[PDB]
Write an enzyme that holds these catalytic residues in place. Structure first.
Site, PDB file in Angstrom:
ATOM      1  N   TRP A  55      12.826  26.987 -38.421  1.00 33.16           N
ATOM      2  CA  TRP A  55      11.531  26.918 -39.082  1.00 33.16           C
ATOM      3  C   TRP A  55      11.231  28.332 -39.608  1.00 33.16           C
ATOM      4  O   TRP A  55      10.943  29.236 -38.817  1.00 33.16           O
ATOM      5  CB  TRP A  55      10.414  26.489 -38.119  1.00 33.16           C
ATOM      6  CG  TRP A  55       9.121  26.303 -38.879  1.00 33.16           C
ATOM      7  CD1 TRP A  55       8.315  27.299 -39.383  1.00 33.16           C
ATOM      8  CD2 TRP A  55       8.608  25.074 -39.411  1.00 33.16           C
ATOM      9  NE1 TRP A  55       7.354  26.768 -40.199  1.00 33.16           N
ATOM     10  CE2 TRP A  55       7.506  25.404 -40.238  1.00 33.16           C
ATOM     11  CE3 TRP A  55       8.976  23.726 -39.281  1.00 33.16           C
ATOM     12  CZ2 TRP A  55       6.765  24.429 -40.939  1.00 33.16           C
ATOM     13  CZ3 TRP A  55       8.238  22.749 -39.982  1.00 33.16           C
ATOM     14  CH2 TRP A  55       7.148  23.115 -40.800  1.00 33.16           C
ATOM     15  N   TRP A  77       0.837  19.946 -37.897  1.00 31.37           N
ATOM     16  CA  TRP A  77      -0.444  20.371 -37.343  1.00 31.37           C
ATOM     17  C   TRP A  77      -1.603  19.896 -38.229  1.00 31.37           C
ATOM     18  O   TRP A  77      -2.457  19.131 -37.774  1.00 31.37           O
ATOM     19  CB  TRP A  77      -0.487  21.899 -37.201  1.00 31.37           C
ATOM     20  CG  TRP A  77      -1.425  22.392 -36.118  1.00 31.37           C
ATOM     21  CD1 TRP A  77      -1.241  22.287 -34.767  1.00 31.37           C
ATOM     22  CD2 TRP A  77      -2.683  23.065 -36.299  1.00 31.37           C
ATOM     23  NE1 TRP A  77      -2.300  22.853 -34.097  1.00 31.37           N
ATOM     24  CE2 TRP A  77      -3.200  23.338 -35.009  1.00 31.37           C
ATOM     25  CE3 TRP A  77      -3.422  23.464 -37.423  1.00 31.37           C
ATOM     26  CZ2 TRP A  77      -4.425  23.995 -34.810  1.00 31.37           C
ATOM     27  CZ3 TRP A  77      -4.649  24.119 -37.226  1.00 31.37           C
ATOM     28  CH2 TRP A  77      -5.134  24.376 -35.927  1.00 31.37           C
ATOM     29  N   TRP A  94       1.717  16.364 -55.140  1.00 31.02           N
ATOM     30  CA  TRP A  94       1.902  15.656 -56.407  1.00 31.02           C
ATOM     31  C   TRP A  94       3.343  15.496 -56.871  1.00 31.02           C
ATOM     32  O   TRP A  94       3.655  14.540 -57.572  1.00 31.02           O
ATOM     33  CB  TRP A  94       1.107  16.343 -57.521  1.00 31.02           C
ATOM     34  CG  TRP A  94       1.665  17.690 -57.837  1.00 31.02           C
ATOM     35  CD1 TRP A  94       1.488  18.826 -57.124  1.00 31.02           C
ATOM     36  CD2 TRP A  94       2.621  17.999 -58.862  1.00 31.02           C
ATOM     37  NE1 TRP A  94       2.289  19.829 -57.625  1.00 31.02           N
ATOM     38  CE2 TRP A  94       2.994  19.342 -58.694  1.00 31.02           C
ATOM     39  CE3 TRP A  94       3.197  17.267 -59.902  1.00 31.02           C
ATOM     40  CZ2 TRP A  94       3.917  19.974 -59.521  1.00 31.02           C
ATOM     41  CZ3 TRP A  94       4.113  17.897 -60.730  1.00 31.02           C
ATOM     42  CH2 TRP A  94       4.466  19.236 -60.533  1.00 31.02           C
ATOM     43  N   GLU A 115       1.805  16.011 -33.622  1.00 31.81           N
ATOM     44  CA  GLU A 115       1.333  17.156 -32.853  1.00 31.81           C
ATOM     45  C   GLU A 115      -0.112  16.943 -32.427  1.00 31.81           C
ATOM     46  O   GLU A 115      -1.037  17.252 -33.175  1.00 31.81           O
ATOM     47  CB  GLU A 115       1.421  18.447 -33.677  1.00 31.81           C
ATOM     48  CG  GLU A 115       2.805  19.053 -33.806  1.00 31.81           C
ATOM     49  CD  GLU A 115       2.797  20.307 -34.656  1.00 31.81           C
ATOM     50  OE1 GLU A 115       2.383  20.221 -35.830  1.00 31.81           O
ATOM     51  OE2 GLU A 115       3.193  21.381 -34.158  1.00 31.81           O
TER      52      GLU A 115
END
EC number: 3.2.1.14
Length: 361
Positions: free
Chosen positions: A334, A78, A50, A119
């Site tokens: 990551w 994913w 949002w 992915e």
């Protein structure tokens, strides 16, 4: 050198001091910040949370303080699945619908490029024909990015892709040498080699192997593969994880690598997902035993029936050193929200791990 860091738009829901919004971002920390993830509605690029429009603005607004910083929008992931990518790169008219939407969307929110996180093409549900089409997609985007460059009077939009490390997934969907030409850089996901999805403890991101295909589940085997296939070292960026992969041990006694495990490790109190743990959930384990796998240059830590393979400051130092030696384009991370971003848990200041990557690069 490049320091690519992935921002996560769901990290804003972590409780207490784990909560991560754009204001927790360090504008000089990384050279490139990638926002994960963007979605797709009617073959067009769209938001997924949002407040994405609001977050995007603070996100890219960081360039006002650091004009050198480059930002990209990562689409896919994913959870996103592959189904919608297939239908988009199905025809050509639809790809145009996307490429033209990507362009309007990136320019609207002040993004400098797009990171492809499909992915995975030609796998896990994606038809074999998605391989060749993926490269077409890459091409069309690179091409429109070229043309948009003249008309707009702004710098050509960047294009990168996050890619898998295993031989299986590469062959199934990546015409390496060819995509490597249109991609400004390749973010190699050199992690998730071992995980709770295995009946035996193993390290999430080992630099080197401990035979067979097993001996290919390490950083080195991943780098080598992408190199030999035509990826110029400059374009190869080494992924580093600010998180660990956890296991529940079958028996508190037998904390060896390769030791049996009944399943995923206890979900983290902040990350709430079995099998994975942020560095700030591991860095300061009270009454645990931290060891180091000599052959893989990475550590692991256990306590009771809990076993965890994670990356620490020392492993990162080693990996950058490795990266320098292979002549790679830089390091990728990551993720921002998984490192101790506010130095609230580890007593190693803000961004212990990522600041290490910055210092060594």
């Amino acid at each position: 050198a490049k320091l690519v860091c992935y921002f996560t738009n769901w990290a804003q829901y972590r409780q207490g001091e784990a909560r991560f919004l754009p204001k927790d971002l360090d504008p000089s920390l990384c050279t490139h910040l990638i926002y994960a993830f963007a979605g797709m509605t009617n073959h067009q690029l769209s938001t997924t949370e949002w407040n994405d429009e609001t977050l995007y603005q603070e996100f890219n607004g960081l360039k006002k303080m650091n004009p050198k910083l480059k930002t990209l929008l990562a689409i896919g992931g994913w959870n996103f699945g592959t189904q919608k990518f297939t239908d988009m790169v199905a025809t050509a008219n639809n790809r145009q619908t996307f490429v033209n939407s990507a362009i309007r969307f990136l320019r609207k929110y002040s993004f400098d490029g797009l990171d492809l996180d499909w992915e995975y093409p030609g796998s896990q549900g994606s038809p074999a024909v998605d391989k060749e089409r993926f490269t077409t997609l890459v091409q069309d985007l690179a091409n429109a990015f070229q043309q948009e460059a003249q008309t707009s009077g702004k710098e050509r939009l960047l294009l990168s892709a996050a890619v898998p490390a295993g031989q299986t997934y590469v062959d199934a969907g990546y015409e390496v040498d060819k995509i490597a030409q249109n991609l400004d850089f390749v973010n190699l996901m050199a992690y998730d080699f071992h995980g709770s999805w295995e009946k035996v403890t193993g390290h999430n991101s080992p630099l080197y192997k401990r035979s067979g295909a097993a001996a290919s589940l390490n950083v080195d085997a991943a780098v080598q593969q992408w190199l030999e296939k035509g990826t110029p070292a400059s374009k190869l960026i080494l992924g580093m994880p600010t998180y660990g992969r956890s296991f529940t041990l079958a028996s508190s006694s037998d904390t060896r690598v390769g030791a049996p495990a009944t399943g995923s490790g206890t979900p983290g109190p902040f990350t709430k997902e079995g099998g994975m743990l942020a560095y700030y959930e591991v860095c300061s384990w009270k009454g645990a035993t931290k060891q180091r796998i000599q052959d893989q240059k990475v550590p692991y830590i256990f306590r009771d029936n809990q076993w965890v393979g994670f990356d620490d400051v020392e492993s990162f130092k080693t990996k950058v050193s490795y990266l320098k030696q292979k002549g790679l384009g830089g390091a990728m991370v990551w993720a921002l929200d998984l490192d101790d971003f506010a130095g609230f848990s580890c007593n190693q200041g803000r961004y212990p791990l990522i600041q290490t990557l910055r210092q060594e690069l």
